[PDB]
Amino acid sequence: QISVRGLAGVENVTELKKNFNRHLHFTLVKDRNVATPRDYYFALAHTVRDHLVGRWIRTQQHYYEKDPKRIYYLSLEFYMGRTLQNTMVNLALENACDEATYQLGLDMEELEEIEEDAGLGNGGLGRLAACFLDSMATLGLAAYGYGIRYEFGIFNQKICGGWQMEEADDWLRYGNPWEKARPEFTLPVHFYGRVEHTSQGAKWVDTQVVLAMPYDTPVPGYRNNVVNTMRLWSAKAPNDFNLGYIQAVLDRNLAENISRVLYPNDNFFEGKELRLKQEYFVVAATLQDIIRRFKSSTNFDAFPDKVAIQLNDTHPSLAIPELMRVLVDLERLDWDKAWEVTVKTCAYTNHTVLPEALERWPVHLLETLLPRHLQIIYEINQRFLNRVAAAFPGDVDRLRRMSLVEEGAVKRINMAHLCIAGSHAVNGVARIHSEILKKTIFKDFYELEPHKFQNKTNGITPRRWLVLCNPGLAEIIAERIGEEYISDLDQLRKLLSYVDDEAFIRDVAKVKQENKLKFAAYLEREYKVHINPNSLFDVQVKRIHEYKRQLLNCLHVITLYNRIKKEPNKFVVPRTVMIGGKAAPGYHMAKMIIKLITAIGDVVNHDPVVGDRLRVIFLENYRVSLAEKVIPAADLSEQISTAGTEASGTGNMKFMLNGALTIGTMDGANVEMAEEAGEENFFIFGMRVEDVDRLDQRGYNAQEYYDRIPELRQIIEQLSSGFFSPKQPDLFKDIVNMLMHHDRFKVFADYEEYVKCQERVSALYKNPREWTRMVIRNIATSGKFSSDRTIAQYAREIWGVEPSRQRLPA
Amino acid sequence: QISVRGLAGVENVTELKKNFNRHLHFTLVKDRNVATPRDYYFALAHTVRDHLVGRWIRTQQHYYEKDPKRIYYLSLEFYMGRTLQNTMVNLALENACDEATYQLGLDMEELEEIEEDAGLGNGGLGRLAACFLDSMATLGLAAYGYGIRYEFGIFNQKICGGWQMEEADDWLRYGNPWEKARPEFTLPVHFYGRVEHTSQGAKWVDTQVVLAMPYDTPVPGYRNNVVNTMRLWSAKAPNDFNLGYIQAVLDRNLAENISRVLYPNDNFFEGKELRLKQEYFVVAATLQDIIRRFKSSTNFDAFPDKVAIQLNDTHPSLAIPELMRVLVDLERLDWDKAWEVTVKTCAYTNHTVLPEALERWPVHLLETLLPRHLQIIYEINQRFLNRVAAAFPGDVDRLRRMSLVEEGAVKRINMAHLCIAGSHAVNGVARIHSEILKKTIFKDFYELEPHKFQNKTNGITPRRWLVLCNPGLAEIIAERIGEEYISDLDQLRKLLSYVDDEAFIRDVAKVKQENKLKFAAYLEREYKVHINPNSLFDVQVKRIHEYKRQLLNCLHVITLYNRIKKEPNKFVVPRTVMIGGKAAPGYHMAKMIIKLITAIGDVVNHDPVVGDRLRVIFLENYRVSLAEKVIPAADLSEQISTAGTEASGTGNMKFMLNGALTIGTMDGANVEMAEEAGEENFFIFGMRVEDVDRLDQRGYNAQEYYDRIPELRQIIEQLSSGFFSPKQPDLFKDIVNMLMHHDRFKVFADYEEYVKCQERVSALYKNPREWTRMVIRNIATSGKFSSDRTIAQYAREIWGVEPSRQRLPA
Ligand SMILES: O=C(NC(=O)c1ccc(-c2ccccc2)cc1)N[C@@H]1O[C@H](CO)[C@@H](O)[C@H](O)[C@H]1O
Ligand SMILES: O=C(NC(=O)c1ccc(-c2ccccc2)cc1)N[C@@H]1O[C@H](CO)[C@@H](O)[C@H](O)[C@H]1O
């Protein structure tokens, strides 16, 4: 049908059809008489998977022969989503498969909807790892993603009575056609025990053993015949485990609970033992695998020349003392040489400055679970603090500030401090974030070792986030400038010379309208909700957090509603306001925010006077597959975190690439997006970082805003009195109290500028031609935010490897 | 190489080789450079499995079109063993695969050894179910095996310091290529809750739900293109299970524990709740499947015309009240009609008369777990006892003896009494066993309903138990009488006309010698033990039980040793005495018996004066795959249970078919074996059932035997004084005490006749020609004990269906 989806050759279509029928028969053990749509999905999945195999085997043998430096990306999260369409895109198989299935009497899009998301992440951090894997393969790097194969990923969100309910994400129920179990590469991981000091070194003894079994998933590069590996560890009890008899067998579950479920608390660090076990489990198994591969090439001097380990946040920070443990206790290297190797091997990426999110493990936990690692951490701390004392003599307070060990009620290890000490590179994820790291939380560390601190602005893969989810837009772009932009996104700048092109303006606007119509139909078919497709699609999708200020959005919605009620016969630009995202199960305020959103919709959507002019919809179960649907349909992207709180954001970049205009604060990557597009082509409002600092010095008094803004006073009075909860008048008392007395994120302070800026949005939308021209200016300057650019920067400035766009033979 | 293994055609060998290479590449994702022997096994398994698929699909569609009466074999155990060689045999693929793998540079026998046994049974009862499935497929019956997919089967036995140690049988670790998951056929099973009585009947409400997910395994008939199904249920938590958040997800394990492990206690009934859940789980899921299939053909009058349910012991006895529950509570049939349907549908097979093995479930367990089933059982009991009272008026004691409810300390339900009341047929498993049922434990029931009671003498499949395990013997037989005996074992009688044939005598003896050499080599290669292959192979392999009298065997061994020590320079026929079998984990006396056997070997095998004349070996981890090895190598089969205790035995039949002579009591199927072969061709000794009864009336006094038999006195004195345990002199005090004071199985009473009979065995073995002629007389009359005969009798006399040897089109 469309060009970017590839060729549908006679030979290929015929071959795909027969391999499909072969899999339906031999693999699924079915005939066309008894086959369900799920059977048809699996037959297609297996057919496409067959095309990966040859390339997968030859890519790995290529790395063995050439022996390049290997990149190991360690993450507790890989938010992959669906794999089928992505594989077809990167293999240029999409049109061929579409044709093959069509001739078999099947609709491929219907079959694609049957695949479960691999929801092995919470949000931005997990999704970044996934985009990175795609870019590393596309850039021909010898890269491996290492993590945990959770049996249950991020919970499925159900909304019951306006409240979030959680249900287990049993994503493996029907099987996973993409993974290959490698039980022959199973590795032991040790826990508990005690440390014995012998004549010839320390020994970790009397440990409990859990087995780590790897599952490999192929990661295809974009049409370069490269297929890299994501290796995920599963927990297994050894066969003599606990070995009255019946209970011993049942108790094997305890060991296997390690890889059972993803922790969904992305807001607040809880020192839970099971999480600590997960963190060490992935680290210990991964590092044994790394060392084994390095030996199968005695001299660990060359280790950092052949190995780079990237730590995705502090979650795999135990890699630092674990590498020291292996080098010192097992390989018998002296401390100083082992430390040199470790530092040159490891690099650390930070993803937030919010203190409650930082991992600080109680010493008593590490003492019991990992006694030898604690000893190594103490030794790292002493040697590090000796360096600090020598550089800043007599500065006793610096010494306590920089210590890896935090004193107090319970002693704790600051894992971020560990990561900085044990890494040759530390990066933030957007320019403003990286500067904030150097100026505030890691200031002392920057003063000691300035050369360590870098920026690597985040990105998203244009394969999933344009070609896959928005083929209509990808095609109209390709008509003008060819196809090379898909793996060289900077080429989108060429679209600037089409900003006054009447045909292109019409096409850009047409694609958006089609996307909006398709999504409006999805909402009716799957959720029986009715929306006006001619309204402005105002969307905020992301995890529910106070710092992300979904609450500020809510105040604007109520403002709009109140203004309509005040002057009903006045014209307003119609809006569909969509808010979606999951709340961490223990985050009470976030769960109240969800209830508020649904409560507002309950009032707004049923007011006859409002009509089709304003609709408020909560997008249920927001996840990667839903993002791929809603983002192409958006007109307005809400990126309204308090300045200095969102490290980067990546949703922002997805919207920019897909033809939405952005209303946002100067926070995270928003700053760089505005810089690339031009501030005139961005809806910027609110306090900057400097303004927030000034308000903090003075003291933030929310009452001041309540007193001086009549429209805001009305909203608070409506909330308090039970306007949005008639049968439970005080339901939202916690929300009002927080806003009035303990709002860390200054919602009221940005209210006036936000409402004003929103009026400027509505004004522009009334001028369809000028709206679309501003959109073209955004798409055309979105190139910087390709994860190909981000990864090329990591490769050159941290890992010391050169990217390559060259093909491997097919 | 050999004829019975089929053709190795050019076309077939070429095709197998390319499908093997296809599976190694696409299925296993390996090349010949990195492939391990396990990879090669799996590639072969998948290649052979491909040949089953077409036949499997067409067999099931044939049953749909023809709609014959369906047989449902309900068992908690299916002791399947390995599947690869069995599949090749039944498909006539063995020589072709051997050739195909040979040309690829591989040894098929080596690859076969890599497959894990499906050890989903304890012993004879579980193995009977497996032989039955093979026979039903071979006889073209529309049969389904229904059971539980245990994650862990019978434990692997390790011998440490002469003691049994148990380790988990993680048989699914590397995956199972033979099964196909059918998550689309998942069914709910209910537990706990309460009964509500409404205007329009009883309702079972407020239940906890566990999901039952089926896995189908193909069961191929012998070269008839029939492939039947074994469906095994796996336990799954529903997705809203327990749905702080983390623990709720972890608690899903509790539901899934139902299908986790096989209960290994084949000796003594324990009322464990988890076992009760297993029993109901398989019954509830199976019966929903049955009814669904019956409807997909309103009128339950025809139900017994289209459905037969065979209960393998009382373990699935809950099928009776569960069928009543569905018919009455759900389908709204009246009690009397539902009961008529149930009785005509169900039949029950008993496997033992030992009272401690009988299932008697505490009422309080059924009250909590299955409240509605208890109510139905009480109602069944009342109506049944009303019939008893009407037939035998005034016989109050009969009423209490026949009651399904047993009074006492704890009230219990007698599941055997339930089974007889709710079945149109009740059978024992050998002629003497079935007579004992009518005369003793079920006497009252036989007097009420004599027409219900039948015999169905057990059998074994000649495919696994001759062709597969002893191809050398199968071939020399086929040379003389052709191949038709493999599915018509009665044809072996033709071998009687070769009893004086010098060539055949030489061949029969040659095959045995080769088998003995091969097994002697297996023992060195895998266990580093050294045996004389020219000695008589004296073997007793079976689960360790007091009634099976491994202890009597031990007394003979010590007698032989003592006689050698008394007269060292006297000639004795050399023997290798092999004893093997697992003990139930809680069975203390059985574990002591194992220790005794190893302790005897420790003394005997290291006495220089003995030399190669006597060796005592404990066969570790006895299981189906080991049986296939040791049975063809045996000269003497020990079947020495106390008369009236072994219901049938089936090991006895395996040995007879494979050229061992039998020393045994007149117990179980031994009686019929002696009858078929002639008592002159069998080594019969000891008390008959009548003699045991006489001794019980009088009182069994073991002291009498100790006082009057000097050779027995010596042994007991050796045991007591620490002769076999020098460092722990009183180690065997429990064994001596039991023998002297509380021996339920009269070991001393059969001692003299046993030793005497054993002398007659040694005498015959000295005459190789006459030994072999007696062997030929045994093989030639073993035809009755084919499970094809047993199943044809079930089909005609219980299920009301006609067997067919006709081919389905390929
Ligand atoms: O998504 C993020 N974090 C998480 O999801 C998260 C997930 C898990 C934890 C966690 C930490 C310890 C124990 C248990 C859970 C903490 C945070 N961070 C985001 O990362 C993106 C990629 O760099 C940024 O764009 C975004 O600004 C940032 O908030
Ligand atoms: O093997 C047998 N029984 C078992 O393995 C068995 C297995 C499990 C249980 C059991 C019953 C209740 C709870 C838990 C376990 C009871 C008995 N019985 C044997 O059956 C053969 C086939 O008919 C006979 O040849 C043999 O004589 C008999 O002992």
Strand partners, A270: none
Give, for ligand 1, the residue of A79, A125, A350, A465 to mutate: max count of ligand atoms closer than 8 Å to Cβ.
A125
Instruction: Please report, for residues A490, A726, B279, B349, B418, the alpha-carbon distance to residue B311 in angstroms, rounded to integers and kept in the order given.
Output: 72, 61, 12, 6, 12
Is B133 within 8 Å of B143 (Cβ atoms)? yes
* B31 contacts A245? CB cut-off 8 A: no
Quick one: how many helices (H) and strands (E) in chain A?
33, 25
Q: How many cross-chain Cβ pairs, A to B, lie less than 8 Å apart? A: 105
CA distance A341 to B476: 70
Is B113 within 8 Å of B446 (Cβ atoms)? no
Copy the structure tokens of residue B637.
């089969």
Is B151 within 8 Å of B261 (Cβ atoms)? yes
Same domain as A809, residue A775:
no
Q: Catalytic one among B70, B433, B548, B575?
A: B548
Residue of A nearest to B166 (CA): A243
Atom number of ligand 1 nearest to Cα A433: 27
**A358 ligand 1 Cβ < 6 A:** no
Instruction: Provide the domain limits for residue B735.
Output: 460-786
CA distance A29 to B57: 7
**B416 ligand 2 Cβ < 6 A:** no
Long-range Cβ pairs for the range A33-39 (8 Å, 24+): A33/B61, A36/B184, A37/A110, A37/A111, A37/A114, A38/A114, A38/A174, A38/B184
Half-sphere exposure of A160 (CA within 13 A, CB side): 7
**B648 ligand 2 Cβ < 6 A:** yes
Chain B residues whose beta carbon lies within 8 Å of the beta carbon of residue A260: 249-250
CA distance A400 to A289: 37
**Residue found by looking up tokens 């097979």 in the block:** B349
Q: What is the CA radius of gyration of chain B?
A: 27
Q: Whose CA is nearest to atom 26 of ligand 2?
A: B649
**A150 ligand 1 Cβ < 6 A:** no
Say what angle helices B768-780 and B502-527 make with each other, to 10 degrees. Answer: 90
Q: Whose CA is nearest to atom 17 of ligand 2?
A: B266
Question: Which experiment gave this structure?
Answer: X-ray
User: What is the identity of the amino acid at A215?
Assistant: Y
CA distance B222 to B462: 10
Is B577 within 8 Å of B617 (Cβ atoms)? yes
Of A53, A244, A264, the CB nearest to B245: A264
User: What is the identity of the amino acid at A778?
Assistant: N
Q: Whose CA is nearest to atom 4 of ligand 2?
A: B266
**Residue found by looking up tokens 């077409």 in the block:** B54
CA of A263 to the centre of ligand 1 (A): 11
Is A296 annotated to bind a ligand? Reply is yes
CA distance A260 to B250: 7
**Residue found by looking up tokens 């097994």 in the block:** B519
Parallel, antiparallel, or unpaired: how do β-strands A661-664 and A636-639 relate?
parallel
Same domain as B358, residue B503:
no
**B623 ligand 2 Cβ < 6 A:** no
Q: What is the CA radius of gyration of chain A?
A: 27
Same domain as A502, residue A367:
no
Strand partners, A227: A220
Mind telling me the catalytic residues of A? 351, 542-543, 548, 650, 654
User: Which residue from B489, B512, B479, B486 is spatially nearest to B632, judged by alpha carbons?
Assistant: B512
Same domain as B534, residue B490:
yes
* A586 contacts B244? CB cut-off 8 A: yes
**A668 ligand 1 Cβ < 6 A:** yes
Same domain as B795, residue B711:
no
Same domain as A169, residue A209:
yes
Residue of B nearest to A25 (CA): B53
Identify the three-state secondary structure at position A810. Answer: coil
Is B152 annotated to bind a ligand? Reply is no
Is A725 annotated to bind a ligand? Reply is no
Is B64 annotated to bind a ligand? Reply is yes
Across the beta sheet with A536-541, the strand order is A614-619, A575-580, A536-541, A636-639, A661-664, A683-684
CA distance B234 to B495: 47
Q: Whose CA is nearest to atom 26 of ligand 1?
A: A649
CA–centroid distance for A738 within its chain:
29
CA distance A64 to A138: 19
CA distance A426 to A417: 11
Same domain as A472, residue A452:
no
Among B29, B36, B64, B211, the strongest candidate for a mutation testing the A interface, having the largest count of A CBs within 10 A, is B29
DSSP characters for A699-761? ---HHHHHHH-HHHHHHHHHHHHTTT-TTSTTTTHHHHHHHHH--TT-TGGGHHHHHHHHHHH
CA distance B520 to B524: 7
Question: Can you list the positions of beta strands (E) in A544-648?
Answer: 575-580, 614-619, 636-639
Q: B665 burial class (0-12, 13-18, 19+ CB within 10 angstroms)? A: buried
User: Which residue from A68, A59, A347 is spatially nearest to A229, judged by alpha carbons?
Assistant: A59
Copy the structure tokens of residue B703.
């002291």
Same domain as A464, residue A368:
no
Chain B residues whose beta carbon lies within 8 Å of the beta carbon of residue A174: 183
Instruction: Please report, for residues A353, A695, A696, B574, the alpha-carbon distance to residue A690 in angstroms, rounded to integers and kept in the order given.
Output: 16, 9, 10, 99
User: What is the identity of the amino acid at B345?
Assistant: T
User: Which residue from B323, B315, B413 is spatially nearest to B364, judged by alpha carbons?
Assistant: B413
Q: What are phi and psi of B546, to 5 degrees?
A: -60, -40
Is A467 within 8 Å of A654 (Cβ atoms)? no
**A123 ligand 1 Cβ < 6 A:** yes
User: What is the identity of the amino acid at B542?
Assistant: K
CA of B161 to the centre of ligand 2 (A): 29
How many domains does one find in chain B?
2
Is B702 within 8 Å of B751 (Cβ atoms)? no
Same domain as A44, residue A108:
yes
Is A51 within 8 Å of A227 (Cβ atoms)? no
Atom number of ligand 1 nearest to Cα A349: 23
Instruction: Please report, for residues B509, B550, B654, B772, the alpha-carbon distance to residue B658 in angstroms, rounded to integers and kept in the order given.
Output: 12, 22, 6, 12
Copy the structure tokens of residue B642.
């106390």
Of A38, A56, A252, the CB nearest to B168: A252
Residue B387 sits in a domain of what CATH number? 3.40.50.2000
* A152 contacts B249? CB cut-off 8 A: yes
User: Which residue from A665, A747, A641 is spatially nearest to A352, judged by alpha carbons?
Assistant: A641
Is B762 annotated to bind a ligand? Reply is no
Same domain as A547, residue A472:
yes
* A252 contacts B166? CB cut-off 8 A: no
Strand partners, B349: B312, B427
Same domain as A416, residue A444:
yes
CA distance B724 to B736: 13
Same domain as A573, residue A542:
yes
Q: What are phi and psi of A264, to 5 degrees?
A: -95, 10
CA–centroid distance for B463 within its chain:
16
